[PDB]
Design a protein around this ligand. Structure first.
Ligand SMILES: Nc1ncnc2c1ncn2[C@@H]1O[C@H](COP(=O)(O)OP(=O)(O)NP(=O)(O)O)[C@@H](O)[C@H]1O
Ligand SMILES: Cn1ccnc1Sc1cc(C(=O)Nc2nccs2)c(N)cc1F
Ligand SMILES: OC[C@H]1O[C@H](O)[C@H](O)[C@@H](O)[C@@H]1O
Ligand SMILES: [K+]
Ligand SMILES: [Mg+2]
Length: 450
């Protein structure tokens, strides 16, 4: 009964229809986000604002930078990265040496001491591999978490995000935590000259092939953005001349109820089983840490309604984090014959039919399209805000982008761009993907700082 396959697919659609957002739902999200951005920039409203709009102390144009050898660090994912970059006049910057280290779970959710102990050890090993523990290299730290800066080289951790939990770190100076751990070893000795967010590093690295780049966006494990604000609008910092980079931390949009009309059963479940429940709600709609898991929960509801896999879920389907976000990419990469969907599901202990496979594709499409559209309301907000703070009628702007979801998902990018463009009339937006953008961005900022 091919009649009874399509009826299963008609009911799957009534459920999937819940992930739709109309163009006016997006304009509403966009307005409300723009409203939170305003509140985050104001001294009077900053403390209660869910979008924090944090000053980064990376000021518009700089004066002259030093040249030579820098060491970049990158902490934010489930891996920590070290790299040596050569900066030179032309401004230009090149990746010379690189090395990535997997983070022991016990350093993610143990103590700050443990975490930065592990970080320092990696730095010690790296410098050995390349006999470098003697030149006192200037160190740039890309640290992908909300920080309140007093300066380029001094700022405190506001709260962890993305499942990080190391105790004894929130409220403390992050650069100090790094410096202490280095000194605990006898390493040693780096001049830590700059700490930046990954959005910031990505914008800075894209700037040199395109001077129009004044926005940085990350859509990886988490989702965030930064942009060049007018110093007159940054009430938290002294001075009204020139421009400064602002770290939106827009992931926390919705933490005071701003997205409530849009949250689904699946989002509440994802929020409630997370390391930070009630927090980073906008990010949990978009980021790759949460995307596959959201798809998993849709498949469980489809299984419970007798619409999928004969109404039975494998032990693998019922385990946390088992539908990887990469599987969302790989399912939507399928070229029509269902073989990629088949092997993913088969490896998950399921016995899928042709129509099971197609339904799983529809679930992935529903979840990632929503992410793409929710994300576009954020960027459009930022860019509409920037058009309105400036004098020209048409704003010509470049956006620097990194993150595995934007980069590796076969169609996120195209859905995302088209939606941004419907929401940003009178803007001409160029999107560029960064090349080793964190490390190169950190060293470039460091060269000006020292
Ligand atoms: N092929 C893929 N397509 C989409 N997502 C993926 C893919 N591979 C891995 N991911 C997910 O993307 C996340 C890693 O993204 P990536 O951007 O490489 O790291 P990141 O930039 O450190 N993340 P963030 O903390 O947001 O900056 C993981 O949570 C994965 O589940
Ligand atoms: C993005 N954009 C657009 C024109 N101005 C900027 S910001 C920008 C800032 C810095 C920079 O390092 N600024 C610093 N301010 C204080 C210490 S370092 C840079 N090294 C390169 C840049 F492009
Ligand atoms: O890694 C991307 C983003 O992840 C989380 O949202 C962090 O809070 C933010 O600082 C970072 O930029
Ligand atoms: K100011
Ligand atoms: Mg990152």
């Amino acid at each position: 009964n091919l009649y009874f396959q399509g009826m299963k697919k008609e009911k799957v659609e009534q459920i999937l229809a819940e992930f739709q957002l109309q163009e006016e739902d997006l304009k509403k999200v966009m307005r409300r986000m723009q409203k939170e951005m305003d509140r985050g920039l104001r001294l009077e409203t900053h403390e209660e604002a869910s979008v924090k709009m944090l000053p980064t102390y990376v000021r518009s144009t700089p004066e002259g930078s030093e040249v030579g050898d820098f060491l970049s660090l990158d902490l934010g994912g489930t891996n920590f990265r070290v790299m040596l970059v050569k900066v030179g006049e032309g401004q230009w910057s090149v990746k010379t040496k690189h090395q990535m280290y997997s983070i022991p779970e016990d350093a993610m959710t143990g103590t700050a001491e443990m975490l930065f102990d592990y970080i320092s050890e990696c730095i010690s090993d790296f410098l050995d591999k390349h006999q470098m523990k003697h030149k006192k290299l200037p160190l740039g730290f890309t640290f992908s978490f909300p920080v309140r800066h007093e300066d380029i080289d001094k700022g405190i951790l506001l709260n962890w995000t993305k499942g990080f939990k190391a105790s004894g770190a929130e409220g403390n100076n992050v650069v100090g935590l790094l410096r202490d751990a280095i000194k605990r070893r006898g390493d040693f000795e780096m001049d830590v000259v700059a700490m930046v967010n990954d959005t910031v590093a990505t914008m800075i690295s894209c700037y040199y092939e395109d001077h129009q780049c004044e926005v940085g966006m990350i859509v990886g494990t988490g989702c965030n953005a930064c942009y060049m604000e007018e110093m007159q609008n940054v009430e938290l910092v002294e001075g009204d001349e020139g421009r400064m980079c602002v770290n939106t931390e827009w992931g926390a949009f919705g933490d005071s109820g701003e997205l409530d009309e849009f949250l689904l059963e699946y989002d509440r479940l994802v929020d409630e089983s997370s390391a930070n429940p009630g927090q980073q709600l906008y990010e949990k709609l978009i980021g790759g840490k949460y995307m596959g898991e959201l798809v998993r929960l849709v498949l469980l509801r489809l299984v419970d309604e007798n619409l999928l896999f004969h109404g039975e879920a494998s032990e693998q389907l019922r385990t946390r984090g088992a539908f990887e976000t990469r599987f969302v990419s790989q399912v939507e990469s399928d070229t029509g014959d269902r073989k990629q969907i088949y092997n993913i599901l088969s490896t998950l202990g399921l016995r899928p039919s042709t129509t099971d496979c197609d339904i799983v594709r529809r679930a992935c499409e529903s979840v990632s399209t929503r992410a793409a559209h929710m994300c576009s309301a954020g960027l459009a907000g930022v860019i509409n805000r920037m058009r309105e703070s400036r004098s020209e009628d048409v704003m010509r702007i470049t956006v620097g982008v990194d993150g595995s979801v934007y980069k590796l998902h076969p169609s996120f990018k195209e859905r995302f761009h088209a939606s941004v463009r419907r929401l940003t009339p009178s803007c001409e937006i160029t999107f560029i993907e960064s090349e080793e953008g964190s490390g190169r961005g950190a060293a470039l900022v460091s060269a000006v700082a020292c």
